Amino acid sequence: KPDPLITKNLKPGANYEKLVDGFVPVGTVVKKGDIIIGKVAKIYIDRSVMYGFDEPAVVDAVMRPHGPNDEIFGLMRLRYERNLNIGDK
Amino acid sequence: MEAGYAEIAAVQFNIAGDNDHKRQGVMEVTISNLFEGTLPAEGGIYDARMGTTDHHYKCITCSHQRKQCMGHPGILQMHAPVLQPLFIAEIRRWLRVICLNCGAPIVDLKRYEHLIRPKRLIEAASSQTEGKQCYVCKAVHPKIVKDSEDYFTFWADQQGKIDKLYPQIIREIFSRVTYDTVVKLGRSKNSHPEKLVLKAIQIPPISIRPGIDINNVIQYLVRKNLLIPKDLQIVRGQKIPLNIDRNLQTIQQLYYNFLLDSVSTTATQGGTGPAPSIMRRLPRKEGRIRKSLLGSQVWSISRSTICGNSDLHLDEVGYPISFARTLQVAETVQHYNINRLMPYFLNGKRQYPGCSRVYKQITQSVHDIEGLKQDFRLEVGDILYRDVVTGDVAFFNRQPSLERSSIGVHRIVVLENPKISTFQMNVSACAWYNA
Amino acid sequence: LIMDDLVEEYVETEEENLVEIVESPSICEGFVQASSQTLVIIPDNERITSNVLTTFEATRLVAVRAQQLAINGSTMLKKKYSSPIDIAKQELFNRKIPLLVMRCIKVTPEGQKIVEIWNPREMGIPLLD
Amino acid sequence: LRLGEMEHWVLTAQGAMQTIIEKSHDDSDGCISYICRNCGEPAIYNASHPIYKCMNCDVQADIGMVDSRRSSIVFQHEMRAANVNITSVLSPRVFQPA
Amino acid sequence: TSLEKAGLNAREPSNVLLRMALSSPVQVLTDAAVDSAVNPIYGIAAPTLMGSVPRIGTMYSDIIMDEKYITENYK
Amino acid sequence: MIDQKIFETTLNIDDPTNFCTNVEAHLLKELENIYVGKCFKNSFILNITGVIQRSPCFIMRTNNSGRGYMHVRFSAVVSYLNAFDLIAAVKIIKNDSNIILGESLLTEPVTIVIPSSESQNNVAEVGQIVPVQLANSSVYYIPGRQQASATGSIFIPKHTFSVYHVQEELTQEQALNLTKLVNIIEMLLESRSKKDFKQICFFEKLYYTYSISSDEILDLKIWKGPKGKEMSRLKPCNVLSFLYDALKNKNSSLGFWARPPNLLKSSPLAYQQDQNSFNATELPIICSAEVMFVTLLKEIINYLQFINDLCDTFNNEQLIKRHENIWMLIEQRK
Amino acid sequence: RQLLVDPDVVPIVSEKKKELRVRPSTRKEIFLINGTHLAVPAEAPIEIYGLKLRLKTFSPQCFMRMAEIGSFSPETLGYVASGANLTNFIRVFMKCVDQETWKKNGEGVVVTTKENIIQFTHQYIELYKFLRSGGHSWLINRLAEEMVHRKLDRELLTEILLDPMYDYAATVARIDGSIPMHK
Ligand SMILES: [Zn+2]
Ligand SMILES: [Zn+2]
Ligand SMILES: [Zn+2]
Numbered sequence A: 001k002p003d004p005l006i007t008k009n010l011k012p013g014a015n016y017e018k019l020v021d022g023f024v025p026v027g028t029v030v031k032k033g034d035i036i037i038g039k040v041a042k043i044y045i046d047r048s049v050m051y052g053f054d055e056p057a058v059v060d061a062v063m064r065p066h067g068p069n070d071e072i073f074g075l076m077r078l079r080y081e082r083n084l085n086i087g088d089k
Numbered sequence B: 001m002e003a004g005y006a007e008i009a010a011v012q013f014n015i016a017g018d019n020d021h022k023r024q025g026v027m028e029v030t031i032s033n034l035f036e037g038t039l040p041a042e043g044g045i046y047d048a049r050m051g052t053t054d055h056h057y058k059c060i061t062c063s064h065q066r067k068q069c070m071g072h073p074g075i076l077q078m079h080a081p082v083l084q085p086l087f088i089a090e091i092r093r094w095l096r097v098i099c100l101n102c103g104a105p106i107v108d109l110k111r112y113e114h115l116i117r118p119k120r121l122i123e124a125a126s127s128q129t130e131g132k133q134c135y136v137c138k139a140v141h142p143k144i145v146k147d148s149e150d151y152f153t154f155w156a157d158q159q160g161k162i163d164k165l166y167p168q169i170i171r172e173i174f175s176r177v178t179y180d181t182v183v184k185l186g187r188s189k190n191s192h193p194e195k196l197v198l199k200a201i202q203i204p205p206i207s208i209r210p211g212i213d214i215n216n217v218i219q220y221l222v223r224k225n226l227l228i229p230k231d232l233q234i235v236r237g238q239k240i241p242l243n244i245d246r247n248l249q250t251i252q253q254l255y256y257n258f259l260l261d262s263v264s265t266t267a268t269q270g271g272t273g274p275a276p277s278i279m280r281r282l283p284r285k286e287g288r289i290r291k292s293l294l295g296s297q298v299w300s301i302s303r304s305t306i307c308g309n310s311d312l313h314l315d316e317v318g319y320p321i322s323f324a325r326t327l328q329v330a331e332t333v334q335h336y337n338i339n340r341l342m343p344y345f346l347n348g349k350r351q352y353p354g355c356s357r358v359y360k361q362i363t364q365s366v367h368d369i370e371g372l373k374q375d376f377r378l379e380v381g382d383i384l385y386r387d388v389v390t391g392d393v394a395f396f397n398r399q400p401s402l403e404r405s406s407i408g409v410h411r412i413v414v415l416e417n418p419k420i421s422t423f424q425m426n427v428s429a430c431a432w433y434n435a
Numbered sequence C: 001l002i003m004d005d006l007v008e009e010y011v012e013t014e015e016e017n018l019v020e021i022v023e024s025p026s027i028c029e030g031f032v033q034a035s036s037q038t039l040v041i042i043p044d045n046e047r048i049t050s051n052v053l054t055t056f057e058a059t060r061l062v063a064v065r066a067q068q069l070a071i072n073g074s075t076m077l078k079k080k081y082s083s084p085i086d087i088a089k090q091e092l093f094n095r096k097i098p099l100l101v102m103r104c105i106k107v108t109p110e111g112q113k114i115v116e117i118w119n120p121r122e123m124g125i126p127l128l129d
Numbered sequence D: 001l002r003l004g005e006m007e008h009w010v011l012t013a014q015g016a017m018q019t020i021i022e023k024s025h026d027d028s029d030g031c032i033s034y035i036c037r038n039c040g041e042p043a044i045y046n047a048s049h050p051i052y053k054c055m056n057c058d059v060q061a062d063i064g065m066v067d068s069r070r071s072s073i074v075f076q077h078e079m080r081a082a083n084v085n086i087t088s089v090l091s092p093r094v095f096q097p098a
Numbered sequence E: 001t002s003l004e005k006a007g008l009n010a011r012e013p014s015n016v017l018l019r020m021a022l023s024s025p026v027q028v029l030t031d032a033a034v035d036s037a038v039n040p041i042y043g044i045a046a047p048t049l050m051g052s053v054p055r056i057g058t059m060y061s062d063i064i065m066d067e068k069y070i071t072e073n074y075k
Numbered sequence F: 001m002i003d004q005k006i007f008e009t010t011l012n013i014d015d016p017t018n019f020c021t022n023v024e025a026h027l028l029k030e031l032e033n034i035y036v037g038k039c040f041k042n043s044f045i046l047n048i049t050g051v052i053q054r055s056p057c058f059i060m061r062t063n064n065s066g067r068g069y070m071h072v073r074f075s076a077v078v079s080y081l082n083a084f085d086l087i088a089a090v091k092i093i094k095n096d097s098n099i100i101l102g103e104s105l106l107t108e109p110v111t112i113v114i115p116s117s118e119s120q121n122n123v124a125e126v127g128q129i130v131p132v133q134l135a136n137s138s139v140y141y142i143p144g145r146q147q148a149s150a151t152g153s154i155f156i157p158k159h160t161f162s163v164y165h166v167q168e169e170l171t172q173e174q175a176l177n178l179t180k181l182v183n184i185i186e187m188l189l190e191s192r193s194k195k196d197f198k199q200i201c202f203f204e205k206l207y208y209t210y211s212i213s214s215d216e217i218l219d220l221k222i223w224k225g226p227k228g229k230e231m232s233r234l235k236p237c238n239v240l241s242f243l244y245d246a247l248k249n250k251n252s253s254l255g256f257w258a259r260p261p262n263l264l265k266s267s268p269l270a271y272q273q274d275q276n277s278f279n280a281t282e283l284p285i286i287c288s289a290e291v292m293f294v295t296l297l298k299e300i301i302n303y304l305q306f307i308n309d310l311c312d313t314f315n316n317e318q319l320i321k322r323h324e325n326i327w328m329l330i331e332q333r334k
Numbered sequence G: 001r002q003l004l005v006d007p008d009v010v011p012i013v014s015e016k017k018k019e020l021r022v023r024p025s026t027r028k029e030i031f032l033i034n035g036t037h038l039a040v041p042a043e044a045p046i047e048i049y050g051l052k053l054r055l056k057t058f059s060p061q062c063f064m065r066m067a068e069i070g071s072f073s074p075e076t077l078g079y080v081a082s083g084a085n086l087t088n089f090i091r092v093f094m095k096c097v098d099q100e101t102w103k104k105n106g107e108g109v110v111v112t113t114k115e116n117i118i119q120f121t122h123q124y125i126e127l128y129k130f131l132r133s134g135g136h137s138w139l140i141n142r143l144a145e146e147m148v149h150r151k152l153d154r155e156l157l158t159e160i161l162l163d164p165m166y167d168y169a170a171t172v173a174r175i176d177g178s179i180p181m182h183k
Helices: B018-024 B085-095 B117-126 B167-175 B179-184 B214-226 B242-260 B288-293 B321-326 B338-347 B427-433 C055-071 C084-093 D005-013 D019-026 D070-081 E005-011 E016-022 E025-034 E045-049 E067-073 F016-035 F172-193 F197-206 F239-247 F289-313 F317-322 F324-332 G060-069 G074-083 G089-094 G114-131 G134-154 G157-161 G164-176
Strands: A057-059 B010-015 B074-083 B143-146 B154-158 B161-165 B197-203 B306-308 B316-320 B328-332 B355-360 B365-367 B383-387 B393-397 B407-415 B423-425 C037-041 C099-104 C112-118 D030-035 D044-046 D051-053 D064-069 D084-088 E038-040 E062-065 F002-010 F047-054 F071-079 F090-094 F101-104 F110-113 F132-134 F148-154 F163-166 F256-258 F269-273 F285-287 G009-013 G046-054
Touching: B010 E016, B010 E025, B018 B197, B074 B085, B074 B167, B074 B214, B074 B242, B085 B117, B085 B143, B085 B154, B085 B167, B085 B242, B085 E025, B167 B197, B214 B242, B288 D070, B288 E016, B288 E045, B316 B321, B316 B393, B321 B407, B328 B355, B338 B355, B338 B383, B407 B423, B407 B427, B407 D005, B423 B427, C055 C084, C055 C099, C055 E062, D005 D019, D019 D030, D019 D064, D030 D070, D064 D070, D070 D084, D084 E025, E005 E016, E016 E025, E016 E045, E062 F016, E067 F016, F002 F016, F002 G134, F016 F047, F016 F071, F163 F289, F172 F239, F172 F289, F172 G134, F197 F289, F197 F324, F239 F269, F239 F289, F285 G089, F285 G114, F289 G134, F317 F324, G046 G114, G060 G074, G060 G134, G074 G089, G074 G114, G074 G134, G089 G114, G114 G134
Parallel strands: B306 B423, B316 B407, C037 C112, F110 F148, F163 F285
Antiparallel strands: B010 D084, B010 E038, B074 B197, B143 B154, B154 B161, B316 B423, B328 B383, B355 B365, B355 B383, B393 B407, C099 C112, C099 E062, D030 D064, D044 D051, F002 F071, F047 F071, F090 F101, F101 F110, F132 F148, F163 F256, F256 F269, G009 G046
């Protein structure tokens, strides 16, 4: 979680709440303004990720896998409840 | 002071020379450094006097915060002259028309009068002009050939004896040319052959090279120019050191790659051959002209799938309420509309119809609707950005826009059902858009 | 190292067949500045353009008046309206719009701009409806 | 979201303008450009910081305000960097007779 | 004259910016500089490439303020 | 030199509806706000005179702002300063700028740059007033600035002069030009007579070139009286009287003219001699009598303006003594 | 020389005479004594005997243009006015030198002797110091203003926990009950 005291790059109008250990907990609904997989640099500058999509999603995936360079990356998965909407082909 | 409104009535194109760069340029590039801390280095290719591409610092030259600043040219005083990459063909057609020793034309200016002015010099270059004897200085005109392994280097053959026509030598030869030869060969006085050799190139404003890939070429060009000694004086057939010869070639080759890399053009004299060059940004569909000038990315526009609604008039479009609250209509606050705009202002983001933006003329600033509890009213002269309502006009367009009816104005019908996200139109309206 | 995503190459193949001694003065040539023009208003009895506003000209008049009513607030409408567009439209229809239509037909090389100034309050109004 | 060549052609066919002005300048890269009107070259103007100058003829500068697009200015800068000079003549002033 | 680039050169030779917008912008610009071409701003492509907006229907006719009318009826 | 210059400009009218309610008054107020107090187009513009021509209040085409611009052609009172021009009052501002900077406090705002290489300066501290001679470097009227920028030296009477050899006669049009010029010098001379005479005597003796010219002898009110002092050599002539009789078309000017340092600079006197009897360090210049009369007349103009402003600014003896380090300095370099 | 910085001043080449070497600060168009054209590099060292000032015939409309612009310096305004018949200051200063022995090409005054060259340069310096002088500035301002006036007036775990066999090993431990069902 980017600490609000240091900040120096916080996104304008973002949530930054609902983050646990830098990641949104599974089963949590994320809206357009919310921040997911919070990240920082100069360890401070803010490199966190905002959701962005208009459609609110839910999170059921959290893991920190080792990459090909033996480095940790975020990789959270977002789930959408898609009924047959008007305009669906 | 005051800069009165003006409109461009005409545009005149000319070849830019050393003097134009010197008077137009706002500074001179002297160092190859990039940044002194977080600020651009004074004298560097990033110096803020060329403009600003960051919100931290202004232009210094114009004191504008990036958006209002439009960049300013720089100067890189080349220690040795260079040929203008776009006008290599003109340099070739000028070399084999004038006497390399006395500047007077070797062709007959009398015989070329009856043609049109634009074609005179091309037709002069078309003739043989090989081994001709100059009338006024009795010096034999050599053979001019294009170096086959690059697009810029020239080779002067004197009955089998060859000596490289270096840009400095070409510059002296062209300076030997008088204005009478230029005019009588049809070329404009502003197109004098002297302008085709550059001793001070223009470092482009940071507006056209933002983000810290073309800057790599310029920085490479600045570095290799410093290696060139400032006291080079190349007379014809000097046989300069081959290390300097290789260094000079990179100076000319890098500048050519800076402008005409990956661009062929029909009049390119030559044959044998990263960041796209300056001239590569222009052509093709994704180029500067067809993508950024003849078209544009616009704000305050929405796109969605269309669908039929038999209960809408032919001049009405069904606009989902999610899109109507996103796009806004700018209504100014006056005496005649202050009563009408009050329900929009009071609703805010909370209820529809509402608004979240207010422009304060007293502060010349835009306020979001959350921070206007102390306002309690809007003053005359304010601009209110209110949500789109039923009855508003909207432009409705299907790509490809082939016919005149491909863009039409429909009366908005806001659909308040949150489960609808399509653009709804009457079926009879589809004949306008071929949809 | 397979790079891929090449920048291609671009080729142009066509030709543009665009069909007293002299020296360098600085005042005979140059002069990027254009000579100031003088406005010649064609007399009201010599005007040969349409006395009916085109839909383009009527739309331009209404738009200009509506914008000026957005910045100002003064009008001549007895019936008040809540929108500048409506005020400007009714001002055009009621023939009390404070704007003139200047139609320019010439640019004489002597620096002479010949125009016909048309009064929208005396002109015919197109459909617009 | 793009208003390409064909949208501009259609709006031009409709004789639109204003909508073209709004979408292509106000809702796009609409900037304001300054030309000296004496040399035709871009000039430096600022009202906050009182600077009013052009580097071509300084003391005889007559900066005019020309509406433009940042894409157009970038295009002209790219052309100038290619060592072809662009001079804008600017529309002459008109004066009704005394 | 054709509708190809050759036809446009014949009909509108001085309209450099129109010819650059059509095809081969580098070539036509190159000859524009050497010929010292003066391009008057008219049509659609030329004012569009210069960041301006074409003088056609809506903005074909100038609008000027009515000094005489405003003086009588707005003071 | 103050004067009138005709300008051209385009305004920007944010409220064309409210602007046209009184076009001429609003136009004049806008012009006064924009251009008064700022140099614009190689002139300073002191006061805006009424407009000459204007355009109809157009509407801005290339934007949806709805504003108008309107072109204006107007005349204004402009102060243009030349080379060798005489300025009589300059305030020193800072001594930390060792190159020495000054600000004129006359009716023509100029910021002067007196070089410190010459030793006749660096003696004037901050706060004192000392006149300056403008060098041959051209006054820079950078547009938009509140005052002119120029470089000039502290005035020493410069005991050098120039002889003028005429080979062309005046025409009646040139006669009218120099009659306007002598109208100006008559106005200046009346202003001089309006001052407290002793101060003009003091300042004229101080800036007289050759010697102290003995004592108070030969009163020098000059106005309408061809009185003078020193009387070094040769019979002088009244350039003014030569002008009016030339306006009557009697006298020819085909001769050698000069104003050597022995003459009183603010006087309208000069020498017309047939075969160059002057002790010139320079070759006579061969050109028309219009050039000669223009040059001599404006020399008199700037000398008399110099003494007039010096007398006006130094209304009391205490201010002269406050700047005591200049007077004995110039008396040293006579 | 400071004389060869104005485009009108044009030297004449002395082919092989070594009388007076003149090095031009910039490219200046020169004439052979025969009347033909052939130049040299800029700054190149040429021996010159001759200094022709070309009196260019200007149109009054040109001075009208620059006075309409109304920002040119008095020096250039006087130059252009003298180019036309509005003023004769350049002609007045220069025709006194005469010595038109050379003729050829455009109209103007020429010199071919050393003392005439000295008189030419002295007259040039005096003329141009007059053009910068205040009096000529005032006179040209009168001229310009009056004529424009009258023109206007007239017209580790993360490696294992994401390993799939651990999920298989975990799910079979849950079936047997060796580990708690949850995590
Ligand atoms: Zn800038
Ligand atoms: Zn030859
Ligand atoms: Zn300029």
